[PDB]
Amino acid sequence: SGFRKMAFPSGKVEGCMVQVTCGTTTLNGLWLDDVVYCPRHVICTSEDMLNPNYEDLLIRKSNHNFLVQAGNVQLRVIGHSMQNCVLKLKVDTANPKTPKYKFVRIQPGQTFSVLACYNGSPSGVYQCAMRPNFTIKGSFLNGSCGSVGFNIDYDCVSFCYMHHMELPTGVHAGTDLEGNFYGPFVDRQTAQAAGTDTTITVNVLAWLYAAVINGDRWFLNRFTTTLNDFNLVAMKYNYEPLTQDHVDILGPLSAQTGIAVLDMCASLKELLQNGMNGRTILGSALLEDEFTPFDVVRQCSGVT
Amino acid sequence: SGFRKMAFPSGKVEGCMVQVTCGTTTLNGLWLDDVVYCPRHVICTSEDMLNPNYEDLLIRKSNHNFLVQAGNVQLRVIGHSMQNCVLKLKVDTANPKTPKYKFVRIQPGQTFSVLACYNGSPSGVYQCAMRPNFTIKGSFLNGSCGSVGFNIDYDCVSFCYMHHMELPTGVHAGTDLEGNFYGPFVDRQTAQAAGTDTTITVNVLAWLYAAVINGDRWFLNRFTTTLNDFNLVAMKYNYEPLTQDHVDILGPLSAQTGIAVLDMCASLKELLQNGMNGRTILGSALLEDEFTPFDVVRQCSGVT
Ligand SMILES: O=C(c1cc(=O)[nH]c2ccccc12)N1CCN(c2ccccc2)CC1
Ligand SMILES: O=C(c1cc(=O)[nH]c2ccccc12)N1CCN(c2ccccc2)CC1
Numbered sequence: 001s002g003f004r005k006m007a008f009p010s011g012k013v014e015g016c017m018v019q020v021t022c023g024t025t026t027l028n029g030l031w032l033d034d035v036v037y038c039p040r041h042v043i044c045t046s047e048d049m050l051n052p053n054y055e056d057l058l059i060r061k062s063n064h065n066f067l068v069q070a071g072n073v074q075l076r077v078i079g080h081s082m083q084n085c086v087l088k089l090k091v092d093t094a095n096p097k098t099p100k101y102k103f104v105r106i107q108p109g110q111t112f113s114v115l116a117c118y119n120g121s122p123s124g125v126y127q128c129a130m131r132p133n134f135t136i137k138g139s140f141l142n143g144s145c146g147s148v149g150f151n152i153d154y155d156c157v158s159f160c161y162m163h164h165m166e167l168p169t170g171v172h173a174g175t176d177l178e179g180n181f182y183g184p185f186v187d188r189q190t191a192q193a194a195g196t197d198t199t200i201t202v203n204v205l206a207w208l209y210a211a212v213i214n215g216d217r218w219f220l221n222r223f224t225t226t227l228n229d230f231n232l233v234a235m236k237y238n239y240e241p242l243t244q245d246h247v248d249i250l251g252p253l254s255a256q257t258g259i260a261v262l263d264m265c266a267s268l269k270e271l272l273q274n275g276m277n278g279r280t281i282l283g284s285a286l287l288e289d290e291f292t293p294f295d296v297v298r299q300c301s302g303v304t
Numbered sequence: 305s306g307f308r309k310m311a312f313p314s315g316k317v318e319g320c321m322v323q324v325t326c327g328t329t330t331l332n333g334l335w336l337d338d339v340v341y342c343p344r345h346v347i348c349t350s351e352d353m354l355n356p357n358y359e360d361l362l363i364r365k366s367n368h369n370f371l372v373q374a375g376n377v378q379l380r381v382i383g384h385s386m387q388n389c390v391l392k393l394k395v396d397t398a399n400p401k402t403p404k405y406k407f408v409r410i411q412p413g414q415t416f417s418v419l420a421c422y423n424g425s426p427s428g429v430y431q432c433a434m435r436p437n438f439t440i441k442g443s444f445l446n447g448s449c450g451s452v453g454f455n456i457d458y459d460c461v462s463f464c465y466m467h468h469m470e471l472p473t474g475v476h477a478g479t480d481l482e483g484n485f486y487g488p489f490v491d492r493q494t495a496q497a498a499g500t501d502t503t504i505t506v507n508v509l510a511w512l513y514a515a516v517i518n519g520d521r522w523f524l525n526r527f528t529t530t531l532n533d534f535n536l537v538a539m540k541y542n543y544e545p546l547t548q549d550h551v552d553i554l555g556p557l558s559a560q561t562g563i564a565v566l567d568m569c570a571s572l573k574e575l576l577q578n579g580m581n582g583r584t585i586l587g588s589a590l591l592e593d594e595f596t597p598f599d600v601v602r603q604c605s606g607v608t
Binding site for chain 2: 004005008009011139144280284285
């Protein structure tokens, strides 16, 4: 019992964090095999950050201008290439601590752990959701760039995110491990509009299921609804519309609790229309949307 | 920018998690050097859990009856002793992954990370506070016993907690690494009263300071208060009384923001008396008390 915002154990990922220095700028890198991945803005100066020509900038750079250090051992860089918004620095040594790994592009509404790093060292790990507008509500300071997001399936690490920037609005933007940004973001120190953000309805419902499993049942009511009626309420409250796929992904939680998904939707509809009324669900005075049905099932079943 | 419930990176602690089996019962253990620590209730059966004579129970047990496995290698047990509510099983092999470590007894109001484990494997890591009533609001299922709580100072792991039980009320109780329970709890399947719990006032104030640092300033007001007046309000709202020590621990955050601690107390007094009024502070619709002034400073300065 008990429901916490749980991150994945970060060990396999800590063994991949390195420090990448280029000129005066320093950020973090991911060392997997004989390649170190990092944001390409490591080759920038605080004059060209407004609009940098990364092609012309990387041309001024040689392998020896890229210092890669893992803990205390300096790594020898033998190659450099730009792939979208990331640099891949070939090192003459494979990482002995390289776990089984995949480079995946997650969807909005999906969750992952972030291992926040400064100078190649881990400072902390937290659980995040990729907001529908492709931003993350992280905790990142100067030097945090290159920090990665990931998930762990048994022994496999699925690298899904690499941190590149903080928007002036306080939210975080970054790329997948191929350098393609999530959202309309580009790597320039320019004001960038993060789209309108909605609430991940399927996650809010999964977290309602986690609350029923863990004893909080005040929100459960004598009503049911339809997908179309519930979506009228969801649209007014800036909530993502619920599809039949979402109802199918909620199947296991509905079976485990005996509460049909549309009955749960009706409880959420009254939580949206009437509020929490000063009450709490799983220690929270608001509707939590950063736990997918997979997270709720894994945490309420102890998958290692 | 951004403020998250951040746990410590769990790597050094994952390298210490083992599986301890004794009869039919299996739980987790902490392998540091040539000793594996685990809750003593591993020698119990579901008949004697009501009131077990652990001395008579451990007498029926031999070294070979204690199976210790780390990943896939079976460890050879050469000694067994009971220290309060934990067993120390001497193994003929030291843990190669033993980090620099201390066994510390934390105070209520202090925070730590929990690496939740099942069968010696890590499933997730989360940030906790030791409630003033010595319980923790964790997330633990069957097999989670032996999961440890810790903090990390550079490379040193301070083991502060070991999980033993869940109270019927949903909260978690356990011991320090010496087997002494935090609180009035004993290791029996009996209904145990967790004392009345209060809110950690000094942490709520530190989290108000974290909110000012990260841009949320709606709660700041044109008032100041006295320690004695603020404590009248704190007592009514089941909040821990604020001492001069708490005002001194809040010194650094007060200096970093230019808001005197008693001015911050006055804002908290109006948050307690008038509520949040449907607003949020750091994405939360309630007053967060699981971040100490040390956590807020470390997260708002990036200490690795
Ligand atoms: O170090 C940071 C950074 C990241 C963060 O998430 N939060 C911060 C908060 C305060 C101060 C800095 C940060 N950079 C690095 C320069 N930067 C940048 C430069 C060129 C092209 C694209 C981005 C913006 C992001
Ligand atoms: O495995 C658990 C357990 C721990 C937990 O935190 N949450 C649970 C939720 C559901 C089912 C079990 C648990 N035990 C192990 C037996 N147990 C026990 C037995 C003898 C003496 C002291 C304690 C109580 C705690």
